[PDB]
Design a protein around this nucleic acid. Structure first.
Ligand SMILES: [Mg+2]
Ligand SMILES: [Mg+2]
Ligand SMILES: [Mg+2]
Ligand SMILES: [Mg+2]
Ligand SMILES: [Mg+2]
Ligand SMILES: [Mg+2]
Ligand SMILES: [Mg+2]
Ligand SMILES: [Mg+2]
Ligand SMILES: [Mg+2]
Ligand SMILES: [Mg+2]
Ligand SMILES: [Mg+2]
Ligand SMILES: [Mg+2]
Ligand SMILES: [Mg+2]
Ligand SMILES: [Mg+2]
Ligand SMILES: [Mg+2]
Ligand SMILES: [Mg+2]
Ligand SMILES: [Mg+2]
Ligand SMILES: [Zn+2]
Lengths: 66, 83, 90, 239, 101, 98, 99
RNA sequence: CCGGUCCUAAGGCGGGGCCUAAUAGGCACCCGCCGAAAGGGAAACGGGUUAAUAUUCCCGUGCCGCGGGGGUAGGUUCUGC
RNA sequence: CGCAGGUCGCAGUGGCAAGGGGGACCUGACUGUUUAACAAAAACAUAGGUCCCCGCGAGCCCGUAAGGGUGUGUACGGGGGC
């Protein structure tokens, strides 16, 4: 598993993800793109998390709450 | 296996697992770093710890790279320039 | 400071026009600052963590990185909690 | 059985053989070294009697020599007839001037060197008979011998002298040296044996043996073997 | 002085080590400006520590702050274009640890 | 000629650069009148000084002692491979060239 | 004349074993072996490192060389030294002749 | 992806050759091979499961070697910054 | 690690754990080795001393021989006695 910090970098992997898992906390949300090779995790603020899940569902990537 | 672990060729590492157990992992020791062909000292930029063979290492950007140090290279270049 | 090599690599890549490498170097610089600060705070070396966080604030101002500000805010919240516990116990 | 230890030695058992795998190689002159060379290493060799220099010739051939006393790493040595007779240089005996201290002398050209190869030893170049291509030299024993003038020798004396003056204070020190050499350590006296195992073994008051002739067969040829004499009188008659 | 404008030097350290260049400017006692032209030998114009350059016997006539094509015409006047293109080859087998102590 | 006393006079009165590195830099960039090298100087330093001095046209005198005795003659408590006489103030040190 | 002993200094590790004559021989050799020597190259008074018997090393100038088994230079070895390291004496001779 | 399997050590075996009345006896020579489940040496861990296997089965997360495809940096007289 | 005070017992390193000491002679210097299954020693070995055969195509030894060990060595050395 690999960790990314920049949303712009992380979107390149998340857009090709087989699934995007979402884990929520009081201050931040972990978004985990599961690809064939790696699991890319990014911790984002909740509002940016909502925007990224909306964009991913727009691109028709599967999203699951874990 | 067991006599291979009784020998001290591998490192005995004790680790606590997420299951609450303590286990001993037998891990390899690091390989020696490259040395200068004249002085035998470790070469700068190539002395990171490596634990297995077949890992490509990037030499410093200089003529002769990870073969001789900058001191030997500079002195040899001076001798050749005069000679 | 600690991630000055990352700053120099970022500017060198941007001058050379390597946008992909510039993005990778920005990610590496953020990783440098956030990982070092988080390890310092977990070990409770708050003075070193505060110096790293001030440097990260300057770097985020210099490079326009929002994720650095967000993670710095989380770390400063943790530092405030640690200092509050220390003051209460002492 | 009944075969004595000196008879058992010739079979080539492991306790009598030399562990030459502990050494990097023979210390001999290669056949066709010439020109200038560089002293790159001075090393200890297990079981040998002197430090060994590694010489890297200008054409890439590397060889082992015994280090002259005073030889140092990075030194430039000369090999061949044109080489000056300075220390560390390898010269023909015919070219080497009289009165010179050489070492690793070759009896015939190309054998690698035979005489004056121990630490602190040297041969002295006494004379030159160029009409029979011979060089008269005095060996470390004091014996005067003729050698091939086309043979090679090194100028100087072998380093490591004085190694035997310091006593081998414990039996353990000699044990550790013997493990690197070929010696079987330790040795039982003949008269401490029984008669089946040694000619001197046996009686209630055990005694040594008088000298045996030079024609004595193996197993009988122990003790003094055809000696001209023995003792202080023999040393006096020698001198 | 040896390290002077119009002097042909060889860089000893760094990536461009063993490459020839021409000294075109003087900064101070520690630094001089070299540009043995990057199209010619491969040494881009920049400052260099004088301890990292080895001066040669050869020298050409140019003025302080001389340009790359100025150095080029000076080298072709001296007939030194191929000497500038040649790269110095060290003999690593000769060096012993006494030389780099 | 007292080499030691003249070198003291040159040190106190004129300009004498001490040290192999400073001597090399003065030979490369400055114009010293004389270079003095210790007799037991190493091979690399001896050839470096000889090559640079031959390029710059600056004479080299070989001191008749070692680095230690050169430093002692200069009254420094340390060693001296080489020195550069760049101003002979009140000394006759430059007569050693001949 | 030693750190804590009167006469048996370097041989003090042997206690009362091996005999007075043997211990005296060992002390006599070892006081020269473990003393300070003048390096043949840099002429510094330094404790040279004996890497093996006959192999000596100067920690100041890095001079590695071959010498005696327990002393860096033997009595015979001093007279037959390489002429490269006797440059100071040759300079002294030429100075005394020319002046 | 745990060991063998690979490598060489001390050493050994086979063929050619030489020796031998002769061989199934000897070996300095030449050639090949064998020789370590404690030496050197590619890469896997945690959890769960069975009456009995568990780094082997299952879940999760990976690594190595070999090969291929796409993108990219780079190259396309000449050289990467 | 130390100081002051108080206090109990027959007993305070309270159990556990845990040197008896000294003088003189013989003998082997010492550490070490030895008769697996009746002998551990004053026996053997030992460092040290000394003598002998040997300049290497040597000396000594093994093999029927081919050949081999000492020897990847060289008198500050190999071998052989005391
Ligand atoms: Mg193994
Ligand atoms: Mg290992
Ligand atoms: Mg043995
Ligand atoms: Mg008996
Ligand atoms: Mg008889
Ligand atoms: Mg009999
Ligand atoms: Mg008898
Ligand atoms: Mg095998
Ligand atoms: Mg079971
Ligand atoms: Mg008890
Ligand atoms: Mg006893
Ligand atoms: Mg005992
Ligand atoms: Mg018994
Ligand atoms: Mg008993
Ligand atoms: Mg006895
Ligand atoms: Mg005695
Ligand atoms: Mg007798
Ligand atoms: Zn020195």
């Amino acid at each position: 598993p690999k960790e990314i910090f920049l949303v712009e970098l992380w979107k390149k992997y998340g857009e090709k993800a087989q699934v995007v898992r979402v884990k929520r906390y009081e201050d931040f949300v972990k978004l985990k793109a599961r690809l064939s090779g790696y699991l890319y995790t990014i911790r984002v603020p909740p509002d940016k998390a909502e925007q990224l899940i909306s964009e991913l569902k727009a691109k028709n990537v599967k999203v699951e709450e874990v | 296996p067991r006599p291979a672990y009784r020998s001290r060729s591998l490192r005995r590492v004790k680790v606590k697992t997420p299951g609450g157990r303590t286990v001993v992992h037998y891990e390899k020791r690091a390989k020696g770093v490259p040395k200068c062909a004249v002085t035998g000292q470790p070469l700068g930029g190539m002395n990171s710890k490596v634990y297995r063979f077949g890992i490509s290492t990037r030499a410093p950007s200089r003529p002769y790279g990870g073969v001789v140090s900058h001191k030997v290279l500079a002195r040899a270049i001076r001798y050749a320039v005069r000679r | 400071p600690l991630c000055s090599k990352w700053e120099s690599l970022i500017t060198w890549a941007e001058k050379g026009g390597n946008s992909y490498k510039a993005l990778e170097f920005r990610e590496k610089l953020v990783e440098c600052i956030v990982y070092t600060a988080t390890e310092k705070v977990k070990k409770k070396k708050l003075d070193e963590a505060e110096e790293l966080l001030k440097y990260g604030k300057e770097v985020a101002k210099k490079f326009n990185i929002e994720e650095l500000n967000f993670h710095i805010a989380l770390l400063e919240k943790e530092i405030s909690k640690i200092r509050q516990r220390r003051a209460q116990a002492q | 059985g009944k075969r004595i230890l000196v008879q058992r030695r010739g079979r080539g058992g492991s306790q009598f053989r030399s562990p030459s795998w502990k050494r990097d190689g023979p210390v001999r002159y290669p056949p066709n070294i010439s020109g200038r060379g560089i002293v790159v290493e001075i090393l200890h060799e297990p079981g040998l009697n002197a430090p060994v220099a590694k010489i890297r010739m200008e054409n890439g051939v590397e060889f082992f020599n015994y280090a002259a006393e005073g030889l140092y790493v990075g030194q430039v040595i000369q090999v061949g007839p044109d080489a000056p007779p300075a220390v560390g240089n390898v010269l023909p005996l015919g070219k080497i001037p009289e009165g010179t201290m050489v070492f690793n002398v070759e009896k015939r050209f190309g054998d690698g060197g035979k005489f004056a190869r121990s630490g602190g030893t040297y041969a002295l170049v006494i004379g030159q008979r160029p009409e029979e291509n011979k060089t008269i030299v005095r060996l470390p024993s004091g014996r005067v011998i003729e050698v091939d003038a086309r043979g090679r020798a090194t100028i100087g004396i072998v380093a490591g002298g004085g190694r035997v003056e310091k006593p081998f204070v414990k039996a353990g020190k000699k044990y550790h040296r013997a493990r690197a050499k070929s010696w079987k350590y330790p040795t039982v006296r003949g008269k401490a044996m029984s008669p089946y195992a040694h000619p001197h073994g046996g009686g209630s008051h055990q005694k040594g043996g008088t000298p045996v002739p030079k024609t004595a067969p193996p197993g009988q040829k122990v003790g003094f073997i055809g000696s001209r004499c023995t003792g202080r009188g023999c040393v006096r008659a020698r001198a | 002085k040896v390290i002077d404008v119009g002097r042909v030097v060889v860089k000893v350290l760094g990536r461009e080590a063993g490459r020839k260049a021409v000294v075109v400017d003087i900064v101070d006692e520690n630094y001089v400006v070299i540009t043995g032209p990057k199209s010619l030998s491969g040494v881009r114009r920049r400052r260099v520590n004088i301890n990292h350059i080895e001066p040669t016997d050869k020298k050409i006539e140019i003025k302080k702050g001389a340009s790359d094509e100025e150095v080029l015409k000076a080298l072709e006047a001296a007939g030194l274009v191929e000497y500038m293109k040649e790269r110095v080859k060290p003999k690593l087998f000769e060096i012993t640890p006494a030389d780099v102590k | 000629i007292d080499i030691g006393r003249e070198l003291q006079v040159a040190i106190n009165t004129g300009k004498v650069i001490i040290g192999l590195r400073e001597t090399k830099k003065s030979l490369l960039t400055g114009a010293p009148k004389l270079v003095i090298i210790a007799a037991n100087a190493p091979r690399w330093a001896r050839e470096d000084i000889e090559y640079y001095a031959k390029l710059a046209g600056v004479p080299i005198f070989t001191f008749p002692g070692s680095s230690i005795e050169l430093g002692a003659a200069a009254k420094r408590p340390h060693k001296i491979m080489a020195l550069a006489v760049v101003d002979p103030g009140q000394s006759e040190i430059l007569k050693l060239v001949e | 004349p030693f750190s804590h002993t009167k006469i048996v200094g370097p041989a003090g590790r042997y206690g009362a074993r091996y005999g007075m004559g043997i211990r005296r021989k060992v002390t006599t050799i070892e006081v020269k072996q473990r003393g300070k020597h003048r390096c043949p190259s840099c002429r510094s008074l330094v404790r040279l490192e004996r890497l093996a018997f006959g192999i000596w090393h100067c920690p100041k100038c890095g001079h590695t060389f071959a010498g005696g088994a327990y002393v860096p230079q033997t009595i015979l070895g001093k007279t037959i030294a390489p002429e490269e390291l006797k440059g100071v004496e040759a300079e002294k001779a030429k100075w005394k002749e020319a002046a």
